[PDB]
Amino acid sequence: VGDKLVFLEALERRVYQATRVAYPLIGNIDITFIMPMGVFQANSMDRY
Amino acid sequence: EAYPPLCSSDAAMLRTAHAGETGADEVHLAQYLIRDASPLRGCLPL
């Protein structure tokens, strides 16, 4: 990457294999959402 | 001096369009749109 040299690991290597443990790196993301039901038009320019 | 900007004389030209962007160059049923002479067309995000 770029001009340097780096390495990386993983959770699917020989270690941490077939282990009955909770999976790490778990996060929950919640975003507020709005929900209308139908608003009638107020101007007459939207029906022509 | 002042370059002619882009503006809408009313809010009824958004009738016909394609994809996900509104299409109205210079004509309307009862209004008109001034074309932007300046090359600053990187506005109005989708």
From TrEMBL, chain A:
Record's superkingdom?
Answer: Viruses
| Protein's name in the database | ORF40
Q: Where is the signal peptide?
A: none
Native species: Varicella-zoster virus (strain Oka vaccine) (HHV-3)
Segments traversing the membrane:
none
